[PDB]
Motif scaffolding. Structure first.
Motif, short mmCIF file in Angstrom:
data_model
loop_
_atom_site.label_atom_id
_atom_site.label_comp_id
_atom_site.label_asym_id
_atom_site.label_seq_id
_atom_site.Cartn_x
_atom_site.Cartn_y
_atom_site.Cartn_z
N UNK A 6 48.39 55.24 42.32
CA UNK A 6 48.70 54.16 41.48
C UNK A 6 48.07 52.82 42.23
N UNK A 7 47.23 52.50 41.75
CA UNK A 7 46.36 51.22 42.13
C UNK A 7 47.05 50.10 41.67
N UNK A 8 47.05 49.00 42.28
CA UNK A 8 47.83 47.65 41.77
C UNK A 8 47.28 47.09 40.60
N UNK A 9 47.95 47.27 39.66
CA UNK A 9 47.21 46.62 38.45
C UNK A 9 47.55 45.10 38.19
N UNK A 28 44.19 31.15 43.82
CA UNK A 28 43.94 31.91 42.67
C UNK A 28 43.50 33.64 43.22
N UNK A 29 44.28 34.53 42.80
CA UNK A 29 43.51 35.85 43.26
C UNK A 29 42.90 36.41 42.01
N UNK A 30 41.77 37.14 42.21
CA UNK A 30 40.87 37.78 41.29
C UNK A 30 41.28 38.89 40.54
N UNK A 31 41.60 39.06 39.31
CA UNK A 31 42.11 40.21 38.40
C UNK A 31 40.72 40.98 38.30
N UNK A 32 40.81 42.45 38.68
CA UNK A 32 39.80 43.23 38.48
C UNK A 32 39.14 43.42 37.08
N UNK A 33 37.89 43.19 37.08
CA UNK A 33 37.20 43.25 35.77
C UNK A 33 37.29 44.41 35.31
N UNK A 34 37.75 45.53 35.95
CA UNK A 34 37.74 46.96 35.49
C UNK A 34 38.87 47.13 34.19
N UNK A 36 41.39 45.23 31.37
CA UNK A 36 40.81 44.91 29.80
C UNK A 36 39.80 43.81 30.07
N UNK A 37 40.02 42.76 30.87
CA UNK A 37 38.95 41.45 31.05
C UNK A 37 39.09 40.99 32.40
N UNK A 38 38.07 40.43 32.97
CA UNK A 38 37.94 40.02 34.18
C UNK A 38 38.92 38.55 34.13
N UNK A 39 39.88 38.59 34.96
CA UNK A 39 40.71 37.30 35.05
C UNK A 39 40.97 36.78 36.61
N UNK A 40 41.85 35.69 36.31
CA UNK A 40 42.27 35.12 37.85
C UNK A 40 43.73 34.55 37.52
N UNK A 41 44.58 35.37 38.36
CA UNK A 41 45.94 34.70 38.15
C UNK A 41 46.23 33.56 39.31
N UNK A 42 46.58 32.53 38.84
CA UNK A 42 46.98 31.31 39.87
C UNK A 42 48.39 31.41 40.29
N UNK A 43 48.38 31.11 41.65
CA UNK A 43 49.85 31.01 42.48
C UNK A 43 50.34 29.79 42.44
N UNK A 44 51.41 29.14 41.77
CA UNK A 44 51.75 27.67 41.89
C UNK A 44 52.56 27.65 43.09
N UNK A 45 52.80 26.45 43.64
CA UNK A 45 53.65 26.11 44.59
C UNK A 45 54.97 26.51 44.38
#
Length: 71
Positions: A6-9, A28-34, A36-45
């Motif tokens: 179970x890899x971290x989705x 901002x952590x990189x969402x795997x391009x594997x 649906x699509x390549x993305x970057x989720x941002x961590x707010x304060x």
């Protein structure tokens, strides 16, 4: 031993269309391009996640603004 297959989705179903207040994000952590699509989720304060397309301008711009989240 356990949920090793179970890899971290870290992928999201859709990215935020509204432009975040760049400053409000802290990293901002990189969402795997594997996924649906390549993305970057941002961590707010506040520790809130904001999924964004790494190929989207305002997204890459924040990524060049905030560092990559180590988590």
């Amino acid at each position: 031993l356990g949920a090793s297959w179970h890899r971290p989705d870290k992928c999201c179903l859709g990215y935020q269309k509204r432009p975040l207040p760049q400053v409000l994000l802290s990293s901002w952590y990189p969402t795997s391009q594997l996924c649906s699509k390549p993305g970057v989720i941002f961590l707010t304060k506040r520790g809130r996640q904001v999924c964004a397309d790494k190929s989207k301008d305002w997204v890459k711009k924040l990524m060049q603004q905030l560092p990559v989240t180590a988590r």
